[PDB]
């Protein structure tokens, strides 16, 4: 993928439960897989800011619940490093449901998003109210 523009210490693994920062009807998401990733023996697959991930809806509306969808990690608690050396970290771990074209499935995003994620997924960005 296009360079992110910052160094990331993946703060998530397969099975992690995260916030769904949008208005799709999904409240909690469980990480199932990480797009383009391949690990090593015994290593739990990891994902962090900017990665596209396959997810399962854990909490939310009946219609959304249990559906296996694609998403994009927009926030994480583990720090990331920007070109100028500063570390950046969020209050929680969150992702946004996305379609086969990487367009957000929802209409509105909830909470801030890392500028770096915005650069990668523009249509996702053109939904953000706060970009940090």
């Amino acid at each position: 993928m296009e360079a992110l523009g910052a160094d990331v210490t993946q703060g998530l693994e397969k099975g992690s439960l995260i916030t769904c920062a949008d208005n799709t009807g999904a409240r909690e998401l469980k990480v199932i897989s990480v797009h383009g990733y391949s690990g090593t023996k015994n290593r739990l697959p990891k994902a962090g800011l900017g990665d596209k991930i396959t997810v399962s809806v854990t909490k939310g509306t009946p219609e959304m619940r249990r559906q296996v969808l694609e998403a994009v990690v927009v926030r994480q608690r583990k720090p990331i490093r920007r070109p100028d050396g500063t570390r950046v970290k969020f209050e929680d771990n969150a992702a946004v449901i996305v379609d086969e074209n990487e367009d957000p499935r929802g209409t509105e995003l909830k909470g801030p998003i890392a500028r770096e994620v915005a650069q990668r997924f523009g249509s996702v960005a053109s939904a953000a109210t706060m970009i940090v």
């Binding site: 050396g85 500063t86 969020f90 929680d92 909470g111």
Partner: protein, 53 residues
């Protein structure tokens, strides 16, 4: 840049920025400051702080 907590200047190529739930942003110069903040202490009440001083 200045530390949003103690007030001293943040040595360039250092520190961390905490992005609050509402989108607010707090630039911390060090763990020490971050940790006192997590305890609920307000910089003005801590004598060693520039803010306080």
């Amino acid at each position: 840049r200045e530390c949003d907590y103690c007030g001293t200047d943040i040595e360039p190529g250092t520190g961390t920025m905490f992005v609050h739930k509402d989108g607010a942003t707090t630039h911390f110069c060090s763990s020490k400051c971050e940790n006192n903040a997590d305890l609920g202490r307000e910089a003005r009440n801590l004598e060693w702080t520039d803010t306080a001083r």
